[model samples]
Target: NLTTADAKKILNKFNCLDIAPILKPSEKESVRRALILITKLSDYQILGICADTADEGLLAMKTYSHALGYEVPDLPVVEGPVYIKLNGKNGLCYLDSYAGHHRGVLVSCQSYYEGGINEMYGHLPLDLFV
Candidate 1:
């Protein structure tokens, strides 16, 4: 069993420590699974988490996109089992139902570039995004 500290340590290795504040010791197992997916996919750098409803995530995405001066991308119509790929190699997987139904973690990602940042929104069982 991984303590929150242990999980944060592993997350830090991937520069994913920013999400540590939202992680729970009990969810360490799933977080570990997410870590594996991150290394295996090895491209998108997860920025943070939504931990909220799909609507909230959408607003956040819209705000960040406009703030970055990029035309907002099309938002997903479905609440679950949806993944959006953005420029800057950013990605999102909104498994709102999957995470909420199972009481799992929901995460969002983003990557930064010279002029802006890219963002993602999604729920846990993180493998689907991969």
Candidate 2:
């Protein structure tokens, strides 16, 4: 029962729109589904991180952990669109190099999609800050 306006409100509220600017019409449909799935969980939150490269990943990790007042850790070498479970077990969703475009993004999960996270990266449907 979510509308585009509703999703936009959530994205903007979380400062996530930066990573998903220029979302195509189809992309918005995908995001609506993504949000539907994500919001079903309790106390869930999402964060964006640019992990196109090791350095960028490292920096992002530092900033993420630092913001939470935790010690920074090493960046795990992984491909795009994969989520790195952080110290708090938060999923650091990594966008693939081509789609990531230096735009850091991820949906932080306390717990939990085809038309899901993996598929999402395949199309790069939502979130793109370049």
Best by lDDT: 2
Model 1 TM-score relative to the real fold: 0.31
lDDT of 2 at 98: 41
Please state the error at residue 82 of candidate 2 in Å: 8.1
Q: Least accurate stretch of 10 residues (summed lDDT) in model 2?
A: 117-126
List the candidate 2 regions with Cα displacement exceeding 4 Å: 1-10, 13-50, 76-84, 87-102, 107-130
- Quote each prediction's TM-score: 0.31, 0.35
| Residue 85 CA displacement from its true place in model 1, Å | 4.2
Question: What lDDT is reached at residue 108 by model 1?
Answer: 37
lDDT of 1 by residue, 1-130 (tens): 5454454355444342322233455554555554443333333344233423555445544543443334545554555532232342434433233242222223333334332223232333222222
